[PDB]
Design a protein around this ligand. Structure first.
Ligand code: NI
Ligand code: NI
Lengths: 152, 150
């Protein structure tokens, strides 16, 4: 099934929640409901699971008109196999980098990335967080450059 | 609804099919069923609609372990409007660049990319082929001149 997740990193910490069934730490996310887009789903899941409101970001060519609007590219797409003694689940996970735009922390834990190698996370979470840090670094260089140009 | 499409470009031509209700040319594709992945749906749809067997390609960091395998990034993701008299639909379209791996043409038409204006096409078919050409050029699959349009 198609699912989606959101990666929120602020001041060297990533917001993770305990997996509903496995307990291990994972980025907030869940199944995309029947008539919702993955974009709407990640926003909904993130706020229901943590109380924080986010907006998915990601590369876009900027296409927008009366016929279609482009949505941001996920940070990475992983096709995950989750085995349970009862059944195996296949999750096609659109993992988005997200930014905080409101809300307040009600559930979840801000995990210092320097400690993540001694915290039990769902598979591949650390590699994905590392991809987010690199991406955020480049986004910051672009943002700082935009600001420096505003001085003209 | 989530749908997917496949963009196959060979020798400066792109493979398009006629949408059953709109009657305009579109990239082969269709709805992603709740039981299959977008990758499996685009392969299934492309083969059912054209007879050609394809494999989605695109950028990947190459992550793979006992627990997950990374899938290629779509060429572009467009939330498209489809208006039928009875209802306006919004399709969240994962558009994949694909490559041929087998099969044989049974339906559809190879359209010259510099001639897409000559036929009636679903909106943004042209903009998307331009992205596909630029991506194939970046991949070193085609030359810059072959990827230039307009
Ligand atoms: Ni589950
Ligand atoms: Ni339809």
């Amino acid at each position: 099934m198609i699912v989606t997740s959101g990666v929120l990193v602020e001041n060297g910490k990533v917001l993770l929640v305990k997996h509903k069934r496995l307990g291990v730490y994972i980025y907030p996310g869940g199944h995309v409901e029947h008539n919702e887009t993955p974009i709407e789903a990640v926003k909904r899941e993130f706020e229901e699971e943590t109380g924080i409101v986010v907006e998915p970001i990601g590369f876009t060519y900027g296409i927008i008109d009366e016929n279609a609007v482009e949505r941001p590219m996920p940070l990475v797409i992983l096709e995950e196999v989750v085995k349970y003694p009862e059944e195996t689940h296949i999750h096609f996970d659109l993992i988005y980098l997200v930014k905080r735009v409101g809300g307040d922390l009600k559930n979840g834990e801000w995990i210092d990335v320097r400690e993540i190698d001694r915290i039990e996370t769902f598979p591949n979470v650390r590699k994905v967080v590392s991809l987010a840090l690199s991406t955020l670094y480049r986004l910051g260089k672009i943002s700082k450059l935009a600001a420096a140009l505003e001085h003209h």
